[PDB]
């Protein structure tokens, strides 16, 4: 029943840190330990997402899917008092994330790691020399479209770095800068640079999607030719006309025999690891949202 647990800090917090936590009381955290009371390094998402080393996105996804989520309730001078989240119980949320994002009644909350700047997302604790990093929560179709636009932007930016002429950056910015949901207009800045080195958050989802999208038609023609029998579902035949012709023209003899097993197997692994990503990790629903009170009754 009583599931509120306290993390105890090593050193006394400064006043700026106190007011910074009082700004962000009712929000979500990753909780590394199922038992609550243990050292401060667990509750931070800084071990996975740090200032020092460039983070790949799937690491944060695999970390968030596993570890539990907790809601801060109280901040005192030597203590942080947290509430664990278990399904089958109702809780409270305030949207103290920074980028204001409108929460409707009966909407679908999704918890996704932040693509924004680090200073926007985290609090540094100079007193205990640690970092606490807050996972972003955003509505489900908006989060879908956020992933869409940042992924397509990574593809266009990497292409224009490959070949400058083919891609116009103004046509990229005018379309991908704007996000419209239900008459609410939010302008989101894209990642600043891809660079020659490994880029900030993306380039891993992009390459996985790219190897997947190139393997998809080559795998699909092989599968459709392999499938044909009596008892196969009839609609397949109706869709045999639906394929574009040049995709249909491919001969199986070119790609070697064991390489069929290689390309198919690699493509299937990428599909299955890739599909559950777009369901967008941890999910919740909210019964009622209060705009003037900024309070969401969630479960």
């Amino acid at each position: 029943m009583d599931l509120k647990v306290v993390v105890s800090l090593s050193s006394r917090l400064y006043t700026d840190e106190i007011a910074k936590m009082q700004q962000r009381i009712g929000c979500i955290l990753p909780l590394a330990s199922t038992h609550g009371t243990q050292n401060v390094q667990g509750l931070g998402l800084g071990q996975v997402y740090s200032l020092e080393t460039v983070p790949d996105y799937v690491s944060m996804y695999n970390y968030l899917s596993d570890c539990t989520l907790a809601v801060l309730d109280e901040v005192s001078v030597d203590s942080l008092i947290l509430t664990k989240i278990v399904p089958g119980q109702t809780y409270a949320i305030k949207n103290k994330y920074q980028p204001f994002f409108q929460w409707h009644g009966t909407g679908s909350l999704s918890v996704m790691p932040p693509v924004f700047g680090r200073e926007h997302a985290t609090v540094k604790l100079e007193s205990n020399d640690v970092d606490i990093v807050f996972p972003m929560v955003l509505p489900t179709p908006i989060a879908e479209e956020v992933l869409q636009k940042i992924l397509l932007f990574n593809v266009y930016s990497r292409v224009v770095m490959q070949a400058p002429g083919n891609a116009d950056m103004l046509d990229v910015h005018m379309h991908l800068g704007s996000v419209s949901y239900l008459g609410h207009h939010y302008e989101l800045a894209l990642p600043e640079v891809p660079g020659p080195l490994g880029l900030a958050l993306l380039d891993n989802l992009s390459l996985y999607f790219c190897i997947m999208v190139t393997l998809l038609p080559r795998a699909s023609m092989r599968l459709v030719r392999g499938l044909i029998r009596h008892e196969h579902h009839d609609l397949l035949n109706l869709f045999q006309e639906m394929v574009p012709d040049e995709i249909a023209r491919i001969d199986l003899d070119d790609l070697s025999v064991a390489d069929d097993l290689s390309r198919m197997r690699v493509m299937m692994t990428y599909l299955q690891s890739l599909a559950s990503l777009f369901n967008l990790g941890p999910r919740l629903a909210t019964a009622a949202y209060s705009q003037e009170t900024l309070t969401a009754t969630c479960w």
Partner: protein
């Protein structure tokens, strides 16, 4: 009919030209004995004589059809002088190779659009559909003569082994003789009939042909491929039986057993066994590797 557009969207975009052919069940009565199974796995291949040799293997699905408005076509639906061959199987023990020829097809494709044509190899009438989107004598003989040459060499090899052994016999299989007749040592009657039937038996699916085509070293070295055709022609001869013996015990069986190494054994009733040797040039290996595998 759906098989044509299925091919044209998947295999017709891999192979250039197609001729869509419908086979009556009476024509099917040639290959398959005492069975009417559906013909899905049927593999059609081309084979052209006197220039070069090649096969391309493809399934066109067959289903029985009521769709002809003409009552007569009620039944199954699936350089001229050359061959096409359909290899037909099911889950059970049934394998047949049918030979369609040209100049029934190019003349037949002349205008339910349908026309009757004749078989040369196994003479019956077939029916050719035309969709709105659309040196003679040596040519069949070769698959005959090639194989029959092998038989002659194999038969001659038996004689050489008998020339090894002072021209009598030896028994390699423990089969008790049916009785100790006085009127049994005219068994010269039996061995002559071996050289009767072995030379007059020629088919693509002989036992030694499958012995030529080996997937593994060890398991074919451990396995024997046999065929027994009866004496003197009473009935239907069996080829390609596997041994994963009783044949020597019962009469009416000139048993023939081939190992994958080309070694052969002619077994007579009474368990008399004569060993035979095979000689295959790489041309012959190329031909058997082309068609059989």
């Amino acid at each position: 009919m759906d098989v044509h557009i299925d091919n044209q969207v998947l295999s017709g975009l891999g192979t250039p030209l197609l001729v869509h052919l419908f086979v009556p069940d009476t024509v099917m009565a040639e290959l398959c004995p005492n069975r009417v199974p559906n013909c899905e796995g049927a593999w059609c291949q081309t084979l052209f004589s006197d220039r070069t040799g090649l096969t391309r293997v493809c399934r066109v699905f067959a289903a029985r059809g009521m769709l002809p408005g003409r009552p007569s076509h009620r039944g199954t639906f699936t350089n001229p002088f050359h061959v096409a061959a359909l290899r037909f199987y099911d889950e059970g023990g049934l394998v047949g190779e049918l030979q369609i020829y040209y100049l029934s097809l190019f003349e037949g494709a002349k205008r339910a659009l349908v026309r009757g044509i004749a078989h040369i190899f196994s003479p019956h009438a077939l029916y050719v559909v035309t969709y709105p989107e659309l040196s003679i004598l040596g040519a069949p003989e070769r698959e005959f003569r090639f194989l029959i040459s092998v038989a002659l060499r194999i038969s001659a090899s038996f004689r050489e082994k008998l020339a090894m052994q002072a021209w009598t016999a030896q028994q390699e299989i423990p089969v008790v003789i049916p009785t100790s007749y006085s009127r049994i040592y005219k068994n010269s009657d039996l061995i002559r009939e071996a050289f009767f039937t072995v030379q007059t038996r020629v088919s693509w699916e002989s036992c030694w042909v499958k012995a030529t085509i080996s997937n593994a070293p060890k398991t074919p070295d451990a396995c024997l491929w046999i065929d027994s055709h009866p004496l003197y022609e009473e009935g239907a001869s069996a080829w390609g039986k596997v041994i994963d013996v009783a044949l020597g015990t019962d009469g009416h069986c000139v048993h023939l057993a081939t190992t994958s190494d080309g070694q052969a054994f002619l077994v007579l009733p009474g368990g008399f066994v004569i060993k035979g040797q095979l000689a295959l040039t790489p041309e012959e290996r190329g031909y058997i590797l082309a068609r059989h595998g």
